[PDB]
Symmetry: D2
DNA sequence: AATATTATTAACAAAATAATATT
DNA sequence: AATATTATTTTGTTAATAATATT
DNA sequence: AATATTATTAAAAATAATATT
DNA sequence: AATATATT
DNA sequence: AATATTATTAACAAAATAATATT
DNA sequence: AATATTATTTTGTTAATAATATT
């Protein structure tokens, strides 16, 4: 079993590490998406809709690690700019469904063009281990915790990502294209 | 060299993981600390003050993972409640220095008394790996990325924590007391 | 810099681990191949010849860890039994190259029909960590150390072993065949 | 479940790695001992008996990786050389116990002062990783496999070493002495 | 009753100013 | 040469409820 | 919207009594 | 001899 | 005229469980 | 069981003998 000291020490390490990593990720994500007048949760929302079509607001919240209310308010704002299409189904009218307009695909796609990994801070602070291991780091221990907390459906998102990157995009010149 | 697609795959993966961890950690921090009329960043300041004495507001920003402005305004409020004390020095009258008050140490102590690891969801996510490895996980990769983003001086924090848990607090009655 | 004491600690950990893993693997490998009157090193040489064709005795000894003389002597016996064929070039008549006959390919194929993962104790020894990780362990650390001792040319063997086996073997009735 | 393709990939990877690493450690351990008219398993026995004082032949044939026959024979030879001494006990007479003479304690102490980590090639393989992490590698994955093969009693031979080194030995003059 | 929202109310925490202070 | 460290006062994200329409 | 029963309390055809016819 | 309401 | 290594090929010297008998 | 004798080996060690152009 565990002494109280061991529990306390593990929590303070993992508390400060999560906080540090997330803050650097935040700053960089924001610089990138400050053109186009988008908040971080907004971009998250569109991305989810690309990989999952016809999702529920609540489903959205689950993948997008945000509260359901934040998802509702922001997706309404996204229909105002004309980037998303709401819908409803006859069998049950409680749930509301979300799909992506053509301008949305245009935003996401154009935005992919502008990705420059080098600017991002984590990429650079993780490049040492890439050569040592010949491959980019896979934080299995985080992946284990996070799978336990959030379950096995949540962890589908990663798979879908790699599955979409291959056979829905290609590399030309120095950037990625359809 | 790294192909572009490789960089994008590493980026989305690390992004989703840090968001899921910090969101969980944030929630479980706030619930514990709400009774004392203290926000997350105010608690983080008090903690920095106990482990680093006579710091300057920028230094507690650096350790705290918070901007300079939030440090100042929250440290001011904490002088109002009486938990913290301001100070200044002759070498340079520009810097403002910060120390804890006797109330402050009492507040942090009580917070240690009211600690139940089984409530935090990270802790419970981590136990499965403790059985396999006989000790609580050290996310060496994440620690190494953090050094290259934040520097070695910042990291003194972990060392100081560990040291100052051992000496002043003694385990007794399933509790911690001087 | 390190203390002497820490180095003594690392030596003993790694020297006792290595002895355990090789001793145990040795016992099972011997069992599996004994019906064909074959030494561990001999089966090694046959395998090398499958993956790396037209390879010198120095190459055979490099990839299968062994002295030049062990490789040459044993290979002589394996050309007597008719498993392999000796060939010499028209430039640098010093070098003797090896290839593999249809008899030797027959014995290797037939062995592969007798492979059973559960009798192998190191196989069962891993199943705990395959369940948690979701994939078999990759021991990057050990691989680091081996590569920095033997050089990246040596490690080609692994890659080649991977690709060959995925392309030219399919599973029929639960046993692998061409 | 597991396809037999997966199981073959794992076996071959772990076979090659285990073999390479043990072959390196044999090369260096034999030279460190050869001046003292010793072989590897003999040395291993003297060490065992330093840390586990009263033991049976079967015990030292568990902790040192060897058969019972080898333990009895190599120990007898060491009685002749005068390094070890045999005992027996009334409660159960079939057992035979071993202890270390002062000549044996001497050869072990003499040997300690010929320990030069920079010669041995594994240590040199580990140094990059110590530079990156900040400490020497613990290779947990190997430890789990080995524990799942040899049981927890066997693993005690690690803890005992870590303890003795920290108490009985002392570091001065770039060397380790009582 | 329990399920999916929708519509407000607070509050955390920076982004962007002002101005005192070391040669 | 302007800069460095507060200090003052401007913004926007995001989520914790409270009301509401469907099974 | 879908499921339901326990009650309260309520509101199709024959036959039977009284009324006028 | 005729008629005249409760519960997920 | 000088200057060297390089890759085999032939022989000795070990160890290691494997069966194998006895309080 | 837990020893205490015997038998079968398969990794390695060093000797000897050949093959190449390049300063």
């Amino acid at each position: 079993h565990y002494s109280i000291k061991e529990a306390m020490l593990f929590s303070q390490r993992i508390a400060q590490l999560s906080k540090a990593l997330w803050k650097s990720i935040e700053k960089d994500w924001q610089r990138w998406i400050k053109p186009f007048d988008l908040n971080i949760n907004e971009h998250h929302i569109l991305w989810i809709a690309y990989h999952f079509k016809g999702a529920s607001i609540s489903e959205i919240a689950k993948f997008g690690v945000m509260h359901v209310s934040t998802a509702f308010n922001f997706s309404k704002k996204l229909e105002e700019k004309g980037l998303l299409s709401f819908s409803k189904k006859q069998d049950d009218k409680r749930n509301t469904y979300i799909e992506l307009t053509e301008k949305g695909e245009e935003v996401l796609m154009k935005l992919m063009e502008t990705y420059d990994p080098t600017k991002n801070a984590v990429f650079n602070g993780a490049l040492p281990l890439r050569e040592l291991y010949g491959k980019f780091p896979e934080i299995l221990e985080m992946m284990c915790i996070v799978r336990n907390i959030y379950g096995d459906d949540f962890m589908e998102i990663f798979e879908r990502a790699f599955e979409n990157i291959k056979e829905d995009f290609i590399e030309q010149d120095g950037k990625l294209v359809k």
